[PDB]
Every structure is written in C-alpha cells, then in structure tokens.
Design a protein around this ligand. Structure first.
Ligand SMILES: NC(=O)c1ccc[n+]([C@@H]2O[C@H](COP(=O)([O-])OP(=O)(O)OC[C@H]3O[C@@H](n4cnc5c(N)ncnc54)[C@H](O)[C@@H]3O)[C@@H](O)[C@H]2O)c1
Ligand SMILES: NC(=O)c1ccc[n+]([C@@H]2O[C@H](COP(=O)([O-])OP(=O)(O)OC[C@H]3O[C@@H](n4cnc5c(N)ncnc54)[C@H](O)[C@@H]3O)[C@@H](O)[C@H]2O)c1
Lengths: 486, 491, 486, 486
C-alpha cells in the first residue's frame, strides 16, 4: 500500500457516486468511448494537484483509460472527498495522497509524494512526471522553487539560508505554506540535489485549471522563467464562462446553505469582485432573494454590475451594515481583521476564491484575547473581546463551495475536465528555451460544447452554404473570431 | 438523576452544545421570538399550561419551545416526520430541561406513533403522578389532532360492546386494501391505550383548550372535521396568517427546496426540465428558486387561476403525462395524493429524480414503488435510493423516500421565516390559553396581530416603514397604526 | 350623430386593432359567441366611465352584442384612444363622449352627458342609466353628490353655497375636478332639481373596476350612503392578481419608455407603494436592470419587498439620491413640492395610481417663480427659481401607463373585462334603503381563468374522485377556500 | 452643401432632448469639456453614416466642438429622428441628408451627398472626407464598390454590365439596395471616373460601430482589399458588452410595445441568435414574463442559453407554435416565406439585426396574391390567399428598436459614442499598401467606463501597492489581460 488516504472502505460509495455523476459527464464518457482502446496517453506518467472530488475521480479515470499512469493529490486541505479518493485506490486507477482535513505540512508532503515516481527500469532511482494537471499552481510552484533551491545549493555548496529561517527577505514571518514547502525542499536537497532539475528533461507540460494558477503562469512567462510548456485550461470558453460562472451560481449557494444557517432573502450580501466567478455568485444570491452589493476595482466590471441592478460600493461604506460577505477576487487582504471588527453581530464571512488569504484569517485567529467556538465541523464563530460581537467564518476562509459543500456539479466539471484531457493529449503528442502559455483552439473549445448538448436536449441549427459564405464561416465552425467574448 | 434526561428519548445528549450554539445564532434573525421572551418572561402568561407539540424538531423549533418555556409552560415534544428531527436541536432542549422530548432522526413508523402518544401523556405531581393530557397542542400536519379524535372514536366503540373494536385489530381497511403503515401503527397504539385506560382520550377533553395548526395539510384535516361537526376542541389556523402562508410556504421553500435538492441530487439544476406539480404558495416558491439557478420549470395544476399565474411568470403549464418521458426532475408540491404513480414512474427517462416537498409522503406512490414485483433498490447515499424496474431495466432516483425533502434531506426553512410562523404559533397558544375561561370551530389570528408579527422583523433587514399623516389615513380610511388592509386583501 | 369624439375617420384603424386584440381576448370572444342570440342585457341602458382604449372598445362591443344600449366616456382626460372611440361611433355600437387631451371641464360635461338618457316612450323627457360600468368611481360620485345637492337645494330652495365657493374647510383651493363637477351640478339643479333622484328607482347597480373606486364604495357603505347595489370587480382574483400586477409590469415600462428618454438600467428607481400594482411595477423595473427602492406604510408589504431583494426606505432618506420616482399607492400627497425641491437634477417623477394627486402637481405648477417647458406631449420640465434645479414630470401626474402609453395589453384586460360583463349580467338579472358591495363568486372567477387557458397553450390537470375527496373539493371547483390569497 | 431634412421647425424639440440626454452622456460631455479649446480634429472632414437619433446628435456636436467639419446621413431608412436632424441643421454644426421614412433611392443619394465635399480651395472641384464614422458599413461599401467600378470601367472602356443588370450571377433578383447603389455609381462614372480613387489619397480611416459592419471589414481585410485604416468600435468592451446587450434589453421591449399590441407574458417568443444582442433581448423578454426559446448555430452560445433556463430549438420545430419571432443573427434568410406560411394566426415578426434581409420581407411583399394592410405607422399585416392566415411584421423587418422606437437610451450610446470620438481622434492623429482593422486599447476602453461611473453613483475600489503587485497590474489599470471576456 503506497497510497495515503482516509479510509479504503469508502470505495464502493465513491464508485457508485462516480457512475451517477457520469450520467451527465458526456464529454468524459465520450473521450473514454473514443480512446479507451487506442490509448493516446499510453506510457505517460501524470501527476495531478486538483481538488479530489467525485468529478475529479472521473477525470482521473478518463486519463487512466487513455493509457496514463497517475499519481494525485488535492490542491486544498479541505476539498478532498474521501470516498472519491478511496474509489481510485481500490480500482488501482491512481496512487493517491489526499484526505479531507489535511494539515498544511501534510499538504506539502502529499504534493511532493505525488511528484515522485520510481523509474520503470529500477526502483532505486527517482524520476518525475511527464505531465502535470494543476489547479492553483502549487505543483508548478514546488517545481520552480525546487529548481531555484538546487541552483542556490550548488552555488555555495550548502543549504540556502532562506530555507532554514522563519523570516522572509524583509524580516517578516513566512506564511505557513512557504514554511512547509521550504521544509520539503530542504529535505529533498539532502536526499538528492538534482531531483528537480532532473525532471525538466521528461516534463512535457502542465495544464492549469484556474484563474489564480494562470496568473502565476503568466508572471513566470513574462519573467522568462517558465521551465515547461503550459496550457491554460481556465480560459477555454467552455471552462471560464461555465465552470467559473454557472458552476459557482449553484455551488456557492450549496456551500452557504450547508455552513450558514440564516436566510439569504432580504439580506445585504456583499460580493467582493465581479469577474467570472463574482457574476455567477451574484446571480445565485439574487435568485434566492438576497440584495447583492458588489465591490470592484475594474470600472468595466463595476458598470456591468450596475447594469444588472446591483449597488457598487467600497467595503468601508457597507462593512457595518451588510450581513454576509463573499470574496471572489483572487486577490489578497480584501477583508482585514479591522473590517471584521466593524461588522454587525453574527455577520458571515466566506471566500470562494482559490486561496484563503483573501480573508485575513491569520490576523483573526491571532487577535489578542479572541474566543473561537466550532459551530459545526468547518464553521467557526470568533468573538472579539472588546466589543463582545462575533463574526462567523465558513471553512476557515477556504473556497466555500468545496470546503463546506461538494463543489460544482458534474455537468460543468465535465466541460472543464474535457478541456483538461484534451490539454494533456495536446502536450503529450507535442512532446520532444522560452516556454509559452497557450490556450486550446476554438475548434476544440466548440467540440467540448458539442459533447454536452444531448445532456440538455439542445437542438443546434445548421447553416446553409449561402448563410455560411455570407457570415464567412465554415458550416462546421469555428463560428466566432478569436477575440469573441461570448 | 435528571427527569428530563431520563424520561426523554432522543439519539444523543452530547450534541447539546452544538444545538445551543445554533439556537443562539438563529436568534439574531428570530426577532419575533426574541421579543416575546423579553416582553412576557416575567409575567409568564402561559404559567401552568401543559403544551404538547408535534412539529419537526429543528433548531428553529427549539427556539419556539424555549419561547413557550420562558412564558411559563411545561412542555413535551415530538417531530411530525420520521426524518425531520435535528438531533442536536433535540439534545439542546433536553440538556437545559426546557422540555421532555421524544424525537430522533430516522425513526421507524412504529416509533413515530409511540413518540406522539408519549408526548400526549402527562402526569400530575399534585394527584399522585396519575395520567392526564395536555392543555394545549402545537400541531403540524394534524397527527396529534388525529390520534386524539381517533382515540375518542375508538373509546366510544369499545364502550358499546365492552371490547376492542375489530377495525383496530385488522391489517386491511374497509375496502379490503392493505392499510397504510401510519394507520396500522396508530391503531396499534390506540389498542394498547384502550387496555391501559378506555377513558384516556375522552378524559383529556376536559382540560384541552385548543390546538394551533402550522400547515396547509393539517388545516385541511381541521376544516373537514369542522364541516362534519366532529371537531372536539377549539383550533387556531396558523398556516393562513399572512405572515405564515405568504412567507414560510413560499420564501422558505425557495431556499430550503434547493438545499434539499442540492444534498440529494448531485446533478446540476441549470438547463434541466424540472416539473413542479402544484403552483400554490409552496409551488410558487419552489419554481422561483429553481429558475433562480437556471432550471427550466414546467408546472402542472388543477386550478386554472394558479395555472394562469404560472404562465404569467414564463412557465410552461402541462399535464404530467405529456412531459413525464422528457422531464429530468419531478417535485410534488400539491398536498394531494397519487400525484406521481408507479405507472408515471415507469415512463420516466433513465435516472430521473423524484422528490416531494408537501407534508405527506403519499403525493408519490412510494409504497407501490417499493413493493413493485421484482423491483431492485440500492441506497445511493443517506436517504437517496435508486429503484430499477425489472421489465425495462430503467431506473428512477427517489429523494428522502418521498418525505418532505427540505426537512428530510436538509435543515428545513431558515430562522427568519420560521420566526414569523412561530411568533404566530406563540400568539395562537396564548390566545387559546386566555380563552379557557357546531360547538367548536377553526379561527385565524386577527390582522392586527398578523401585522404585528411583520413589525417585529423589520429591523432584522434594515427596513424603514413610512408613517401615514392624519390626512392620508383619513383619505384611505385606515388608522395610522393599522390594520392597513381589509380582511379579503390578498397581498 | 350625438357622439363627441376627435375624428371618426380613424375608425378603420380602430376596427383593425380591435380584431387583432380579439386574438387574445378570448373571454370576451366567448361571451359574445355564447350570449349574442339570447341577449341577456336586452333593453338595458348602460353608462360607462372607463378609459376608452381599444380593449375597452371590445368590452363595449360585447355589452352591445348582448343586447345593451350604451353611452361611454373615459375616466381620465388623457387615457382615451381616438381611433378606439371612432370605431364605436362609426359602427353605432355606443354613443361616445371622449377624446384624448380633454380639458377637466369637458371631462365632467362628457360624464354628465354619458349619464343622460332619453325616455324611449317620451323622448322629450330625461332618465338615467340602468347600469353603470365605472373605473375610479366618478360616475358613482356625480350620482351621489347630485342627489346630495338636490336634497340640499330643496331644504332652502336655492343653490347650496358649497357648490359656488372654491376653497372649502382649510381655506385651501378646491381641486379643479370638484369645481368642474360642482359647476355641472349647479347647472343641472337649475334645469331640473329631480334629475339625480329620478334615476334611483331604475338604477340596478354599478360594477367598479379599480382599487380607488372600490375604496370610495366601501366608505359609502360604512356610512350607509350607498344608493344602489355594487359589485367590486377589482377584487376578483382574475382582476387584482393579473391586471394590477402583470398588466402594470408591461404597461408601466411602456409608459416610462415613451416619456423618459433615459436608460432604466442602473438607476435607483423608487416605487412608492408595494401593493398589487407596486409588486408588478417593481418586477418590470428589475427586469430591465433598475435598482428598485420601495416605500411602504404596511409592514407586511414591506417585508414582501425585502424578500424579493428590494431595499425598503422612507422617501426622505432617498429623495436626494434616487433618479426616478413612481407613485403606486392610491393615496394623496405622497410626493410633495418639498420632496421635489430636494431631488437631483433632471429626476423623473411619474404616477401609476388612478388619481393625479399622489404627486402634488397643483402645488408644483403654481409654485412662485417656477419655470415650465414642454419636452414633448405629456412630458414637462419644471425648474425652481432659487436652486435653478429641474425635475421632469410624466403625464402631469396622470396614470403614466394610460396617459403616456396604450395601457395594459389585451390579454389581461379581457380577464378584467370578462369580470365586468359577468358583473353587469348579475346586476341586471337581480333587478330596500340599504345597498351593499359584493364580489363575484369564486366559481365565476375560476371560469374567467378557464376561458383564457387556450391563448397560452395551458393544459390543466383534472382531479380523480379519490383526490377531489382527499383535498375536499368538487372536481369542477372551486378549488380554494374564500380566504385563499393565491 | 445645403441640408435636406423633413422639418427645421422641430429644431427646439431636438435641442431640448439633447440637453436632457447629455445628463447621462457624461463621456461625450467630458470630451467636449477637455478638447473644445485645443480642437484636436480641427480641419478634418468627417462624413458619417449612422442612425441620426438624439444620441447621434450629441456625437456630431462633440465632433464639431473638437473642430471637425461634418456632413451626415442615417444608415437606415426608418431610424432617423427628424427633430434630432433639425437641431443639427438649426445649430448649423453639420450638413445633414436624412429623414424618417426615406425611399431606398433617397438613402443612397443621401449617402453619396454626404461623401461629397467641395474642395477647400475651389467651389467647383469636388473631394471626399478625411474620416468616416460608419454603422453597417454602407459608407465603406460605396467607396470600395466605387473604386471597383472605376477600375473595371477603365479596363474595358465601358460601363461595367453588372451596374446595368437587374439580376446577378445566379439569376436571382438584386436587392433594391444594390440596384440603387449601382445606379448612383453608374452616374458618378459618367460625371467623373476618378471620384472614388481620388478620395483614397485624403482618407485617413473609418471607425465602424456594429457587428455587421465589422464583419464586412474583416472580409475585405482577409482578401487584402481594404483601402483605408479601420477601427473596430463594436468590439470595445464598453460597446459590445453594453450597447449590444443592455441597449437591446430596453430598446427591444420599447420597439415591441410600440409595434405589437399584445401582452408578452406567457407567450412563446423565439429569439434567433443568442450572441451579444440575443442575450439582451432574451433577458428583457423574460423580465416581462415571456417564455423565450432560442435558436443557435454556435454550440457554445446554445449551451449558454440552456444555462439561463431557455429551451434551445431549431425554427422548424417551433414555427407553428411560437407566438412572436425576433431575429438577432446578423445573418440572412433566417425566417423565410415558407416559415411565415406555417406560423399561427396573427403571429408577430420583428428583426433587431442590422439588415432587413434576416427576414425574407421582399419575398413576402411580392408573394402572389398577398394582401397587406397598414395596422399602423410601420406595422403591416400580411394575409396569404391560400390559407387566409395573417402574420404581422414590425417596421418592414428593419431593426425594430430604431424603426418602431427611439433606439438605445443615452447612457449606453455615450459609451459607444465616446469610443467613436476616441477612434476618430486616433485615426486623425496617425495621418502624420495593406490596411488593417484595429481596436482601441484597453486603457481607453476602461477610461470610457470611468467616465460613466458617477451617473450611477458607482464607488470604485482602489488597489493597494501590495495587492497591485500580487495580481500583477498597475493601480491605475489596465486590470485585465487582452483576451479577458468579461
Ligand atoms: N416542506 C415544507 O416545509 C412546507 C412548507 C409549507 C407547506 N407545506 C406543505 O406543502 C403542501 C402544499 O401547501 P400549499 O400551502 O402550497 O397549498 P396550496 O393549496 O397553496 O397549493 C397546492 C396546489 O396544488 C394544486 N394541486 C392539487 N392537486 C393537484 C394535482 N393532482 N396536480 C397538480 N396540482 C395539484 C392545487 O391547485 C394548489 O394550487 C401542503 O401539504 C403543506 O402542508 C410544506
Ligand atoms: N394604472 C393602472 O392601470 C392601474 C391598475 C390597477 C390599479 N391601479 C390603481 O393603482 C393604485 C394602487 O392600486 P393597488 O391595487 O396596488 O392598491 P393596493 O392597496 O394593493 O396597494 C397600495 C399600497 O400602497 C401602500 N401605501 C399607501 N399609502 C402609502 C404612502 N403614503 N407611502 C407608501 N406606501 C403607501 C399601501 O400600504 C398598499 O400596500 C390605485 O389607485 C388603483 O386604482 C391602477
């Protein structure tokens, strides 16, 4: 037994949930039906760092049926669905390092173990994955920081001091994620100081699932420091305009209904950030009678919010009157402890963005004399000692739809994961320096949509030759120019 | 040892702190109940009243019980559904000695009727702890009221021939059909009580001052009794208060239907053809919520007025038979029975979801589905079962065994609307108690009190109410303080 | 010959609209088909005071095909559709005294003429109508004030001084409508002081269309001054829950679109009054992106607004911030000159209630130093002298959906007018010092709904005997108890 | 050089609406404030072909205040607002050739005159514009076809026979628009065969307002036949995501309420095309209770429609049951004569796309034995002689919001038109061979949004340095990458 999971006996519930889920994941069902025998990913070692849900287990199953060997971990300490994880282990579909309620330390150990492969020749030698499926950039981060650490290690033939200290370049305390990651890097430098650089040779790419992960990729790219090809799956139209928006419209409500006992109707609920995710959040909240107040830094998004009937305000002007706060920025320090101190009694705070630092959870937990009580497994009420007023935080500020619920439903995830399988296949067939972040073709993007039309009984109109020539498109697409915004 | 802890029958007393914490959080929005406790906890208008409740024991209900308790009443409680009890809510009441409780999540139908009977059984410490009944009843669906009346009928039959009437000892009804399990289990209790004391039910009537009924289905049962001249005690209809029916039934379900569906049905609602059978107060809310998350709602209705209302909101109105093969999810919201038959179920597409939000499980023919020759059943997750027909090999997925899905698969309506319903309940209980000092009929609370309920909740939401000038008040012919609408106003 | 309209040449444009409108007015089509042979209203003299729109023409046609003789006028100086009035006169369906943009003086003269019938036996003598169709209660008001005036006239053998003065009580100037009505009453007393009382024996009742008219009836009943039977048509479920709400949802917008050039999306629109009309107005405004703010006196209605996501405030707390103000209360002095002076530049003010005194128009027009410029017909900008700021009034405060637009569409008016025909037939069929106000039975209310199901392709489900017994109703209905609110 | 409009006495009504409109057009108001002294467009001859509405008059005034000489015409025969055209002529800020209800021949004559300028040196000699503001691409089309005509004329020393023929290649009858354009071009070849080619020299560019015009530009570019620089205004975020969507949401409803007497609630309304325009149309229709059914060729757009709860079907499966049909495709022959013959009695047909050929109006009008009645101004009922069934067409299939109503409101037009002015200034500045189509920068696109925030009381949030660096943007924008879809 190499996998490290919660409980293998939950396998059958997972397997059963996978089959029910699969009814609507027609994109993944079709890729399996079309490629299970030809196996286009045969020989590929794939490491995944992505919320291990039932939907994800179907993604993993799909990659496995296309011939890949798979190792997997979750990209969040609270998102793993333990029955989903056990289904993959029992069936020998993948080697898994993930469980619900991981410590930060265990998060980084699991990611590192998922990145570790034993060479098919001899078990003595370690090697890396050929491909990476990433959500948030953590697997991509540990690889680049691993390489940087090794280069610093050789340069002075000793452990770089930045890995043996609790402080950053400016004397401040390092985040728990960096301390735990640096601890893993130091350990690996002593076991093998060419571990990370040795992987670069066999690494053919990474396919990134989400906006926060993409931003990280784009930053590396513009600095000329990206060390492998990358496909941006987030910005496929069938991902960003469906998963991000429609997926959150349902999964935000599910997370809120599970964690927040109150009625949303008539409540002033602040949605911080009105991008693809924020738009979905507001639509769902209004659907159940909430009066949505939006905050934005972008004047275009602000205007869009206003066109849908929502008030647009700065947090300071509403922090004392609003009832519920939802961060959807992908930024950091959007809700501070100071903001929290001004909120009304039993105001709720939740985050749906990828990382928990949108909310100053650290400042809240380390506030002098603060009291905390567990409302439920993942809901905590914090009471400030000076005012005696309390705020209620959902799942310690981690993405609420996956921390307090089961994330987006199968339909949109099938669309997102169909893009993932296609991105992986593209990277694999192109396998062989300035590396780029590219997106999938519009042809494939439309194809993903075509694969899901029958789920919903959608009947598509077909162009005539005359109409096609008139609007200047092929009868079979693509139907829009590259800059079309949908 | 504590009498409340020992006498109560719940699942786990250790969950009490979670219950108490939830109750405190809920109180932020349950301003109606918070105010009644503040205003009356000293003078205790319900002092000495023995109240028996039969209403889903949720956190919201625990605050209701706490309110009756702070007003001076002794209390015993049970839920009105085998799956709706929230064990932490029940534990909270037992640990604080607020009430003697007989309720847990996932009861059997036998246990359900034994808990109700026990909730109706009191002892008088001033009369050598001898058996008696409650003074007041809080009912949701009319089961407390049913056992009382069937209890009186049973005793009247028993007394004629000095023996147990044979309709209690038989597993079949008047038409030779197999009795529902609820009737069998209720008759079993009635038979046992006739042997303990054949003057038990009629003996309670002396001290019973009324029942206050929470929902549409329980009210229907009351009106049927009243029109037949068989209602044995005064009743207050709480469901038809404006601050109950226009809020709990509609806006409560808008949220709680979705929560139940999200927990039981893993699939995305967006784009699905979802049938909502019944477009009354509950259906209106279900529809609004469903389309709020992208579903395409199709309505079935028997009332041409309601059907037209659905159509005005952009919904297709169809007969079930015309969409039973194409629709993805079916939600019954009628309060009727046999709305979705086994025969309808056999025609549904593969993996169609079926759920009910009405009070009783018989809206969907669950019994006929479970007892269909050769049917195959597997438990997907908690209270979610897939049934497979042997002749077609097609499957349908039933949520909560047909039981009201918002309470059985989720936590029911949220605190805010429940406070509005429960403020009406406390007012009704007080009205019946102060009144203690053809024959019996059903009545509703006055509009003054109905408007009062709403006033108590305006600050929760930062609502600012405009005030009429004398000139305006005289012009529209109302008092500055209300009521602001005539009795027939529909809101 | 005896009709007074603007132009009879428009008739053809009215007759075409009537036929098109009849596609959706199935209730009226059905009553015509079913009762035109037997003619249940045969010999009845019907006077109508109801906005003479295309829809009203179909109502009047239906009363005519059913054997009635008819005289009609509009219940508002701006609501008449000239092509509709022409159609009725051209085909000799009714005698009409109505045109768009009447003066208030002519309004009362037109009404008084509509009430004046000639005795079929001896036409040299006057008589009144047998039945009245009323909207707002003006026909009912002139009858009752006329009777009061005649009685007062006899006690002192002279014109009562209240009819000749023009202040009354507080010394405040009397409304133009009362002065013009009193002028007509004075003129009729001098010609025949038994005119009004002479109509009482043969008057079999009035059927009242709207909330404001019903309110006036209820006041008369509580004081024991109601002089004839009345049917409250507004409170049929198929009128109040459809016309008041869904009719306004479309016609308000249409009225706002013709008079207000500005975009509604993003604007803070205050809807004063959240009753059957207010609910519909809000729904329509939200539908095109406006942020609706509600004002209410009734806490129940205020809570309903909150449950639909609308902020509920008092006018004084938003009068300076809001962009548009829509009164829908059926009350008076809701928007005062003092409120208007605090409004922002080019703020729009409109009314959808029956009467124009919801907004203090008289006070605005007669403000010292006020400047007024007509932007277009029925749209005026008023500029205050001190601040130099302006407000824009639609329709001189008259119901904006009928004054600036064509009112509710055919479908809902058919439901309302099907109730009217049924009411007229009930009062005629039934032909005592005390008279009361009653409503149609729920059987007939449900019948109105049944007649319109085929329009929209609605398929109704039918109860089995065991279900009908279980829910305690008859298979053919009624399906709800009398206190059911729908 | 003397204007041709309907009636100059309407001037004050236009000038009055202009000032009221300016309240929301803060983009154009700002450009006037900032650049009226320096006049960056001084000396520039600007010819515009764009619906001459009140909104357009503020655009022309802005262009004038920036120093340009201006001559203008509408891009549709029914969209001109005569009072708007009058205001421009009265204020003498532009030479105008436009009026409501033009003939097709007049349209091309007006456009050709708008393209004709008297040489800055001589009064006898003719020249062309320096810049073109176009909507639909007709100004751009006449120029390119004018050049082709001249080149073909010199090639064989004769009038090209395609200009004289009434049919074209496939034997089908040429559209009236083509026959009229060709007649104008034929005549210009005789007066001066180097007219069009003479213009290319002084033409610095065209700025195209809409999707259909852009498509035409992209086709010419791909073929390497574009003869001047071009700026695609349609695809600025502040145009396509506001004008096309939220503009139509209000203006479609305005057009339908004016042309269609029926209630939209409950009706099955088919929206053909679910792009930027269709999205808005559907939302506005749903908002008034309609049951929207969508037709699409694009599987992504079709899925999006399904995610909003709309049924997605092919026209043939609903053509007999639907009540109202709205084309929003920018394609042609979307609704054929055969489809119209299958529609139910009194079905309504309207188009909101740029050209009238989305619906086969020509075929309908010229159908053998077709009866047609004018229901009202710009609304016609057509009855087929075989079935005796009727269909009702709004403004002869021309864009319904501008034909049956007053187009989009000022707010969105200011956003669209602020982009036009910015583009014209860009083209004019660059004057100091393959031509391409470019779009404005995201800096300017966001700037357009900023200019309109105060209208709606929008409070923008400002990024901190730490936040700015974390998400890798400047504190002052741009805040999104180029491919961001909003
Ligand atoms: N789950 C909850 O929390 C909750 C909340 C409130 C009420 N309820 C229950 O919900 C049920 C409905 O309550 P309501 O207040 O909406 O009652 P209602 O009378 O307002 O609505 C029921 C509707 O069902 C329609 N109907 C009846 N039989 C039908 C059939 N065979 N097909 C189609 N339509 C049919 C009726 O015309 C009616 O409009 C009741 O059982 C009530 O006790 C449950
Ligand atoms: N324009 C139309 O086509 C049309 C259609 C139907 C009714 N009406 C008219 O519209 C008016 C309202 O009709 P309704 O059916 O909605 O009546 P309603 O009683 O249902 O609604 C009126 C609401 O206004 C509120 N109100 C009263 N005074 C107020 C004040 N000073 N400030 C704030 N709120 C106040 C009341 O609480 C009430 O809820 C009446 O005059 C009626 O005749 C017009």
């Amino acid at each position: 037994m190499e996998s490290r999971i919660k409980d293998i006996s939950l396998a059958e519930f997972g397997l059963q949930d996978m089959e029910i889920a699969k009814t609507d994941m027609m994109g993944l069902v079709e890729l399996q039906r079309k490629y299970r025998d030809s196996k286009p990913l045969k020989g590929a070692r794939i490491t995944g760092s992505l919320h291990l849900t039932i939907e994800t287990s179907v993604l993993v199953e799909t990659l496995y049926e296309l011939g890949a060997e798979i190792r997997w971990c979750s990209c969040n300490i609270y998102s793993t669905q333990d029955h989903a994880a056990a289904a993959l282990v029992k069936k020998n579909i993948a080697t898994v390092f993930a469980w619900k309620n991981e410590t930060i330390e265990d998060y980084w150990v699991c990611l590192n173990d998922a990145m570790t492969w034993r060479n098919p020749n001899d078990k003595d030698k370690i090697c890396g994955p050929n491909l990476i499926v990433d959500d948030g950039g953590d697997a991509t981060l540990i690889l680049h920081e691993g390489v940087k650490a090794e280069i610093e290690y050789e340069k002075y033939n000793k452990i770089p001091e930045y890995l043996e200290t609790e402080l950053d370049e400016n004397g401040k305390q390092l985040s728990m994620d960096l301390k735990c990651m640096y601890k893993v890097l130091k350990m690996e430098l002593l076991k093998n100081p060419f571990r990370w650089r040795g992987m670069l040779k066999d690494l053919y790419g990474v396919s990134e699932e989400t906006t926060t992960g993409v931003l990280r990729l784009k930053i590396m790219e513009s600095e000329g420091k990206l060390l492998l090809p990358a496909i941006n799956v987030n910005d496929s139209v069938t991902k960003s305009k469906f998963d991000n928006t429609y997926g959150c419209r349902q999964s935000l409500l599910h997370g809120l209904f599970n964690g927040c006992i109150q009625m949303l109707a008539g409540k002033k609920i602040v949605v911080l950030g009105y991008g693809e995710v924020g738009k979905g959040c507001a639509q769902g909240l209004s659907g159940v009678g909430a009066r949505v107040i939006v905050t934005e830094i972008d004047p275009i998004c602000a205007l869009q919010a206003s066109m849908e009937g929502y008030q647009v305000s700065v947090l300071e002007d509403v922090v004392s009157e609003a009832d519920i706060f939802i961060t959807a920025t992908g930024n950091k320090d959007v809700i501070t402890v100071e903001h929290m101190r001004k909120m009304k009694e039993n105001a709720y705070i939740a985050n749906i963005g990828h990382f928990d630092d949108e909310i100053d959870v650290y400042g809240l937990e380390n506030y002098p004399g603060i009291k905390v009580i567990e409302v439920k497994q993942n809901v905590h009420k914090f009471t400030f000692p000076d005012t005696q007023k309390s705020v209620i935080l959902l799942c310690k500020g981690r993405l609420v739809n996956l921390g307090c619920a089961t994330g987006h439903p199968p339909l949109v995830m099938s669309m997102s994961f169909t893009n993932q399988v296609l991105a992986q296949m593209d990277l694999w067939k192109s396998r062989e320096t300035r590396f780029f972040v590219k997106k999938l073709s519009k042809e494939l993007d439309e194809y993903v949509a075509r694969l899901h039309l029958d789920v919903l009984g959608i009947k598509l109109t077909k162009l005539t030759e005359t109409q096609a020539k008139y609007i200047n498109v092929s009868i079979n697409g693509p139907y829009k120019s590259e800059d079309y915004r949908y």
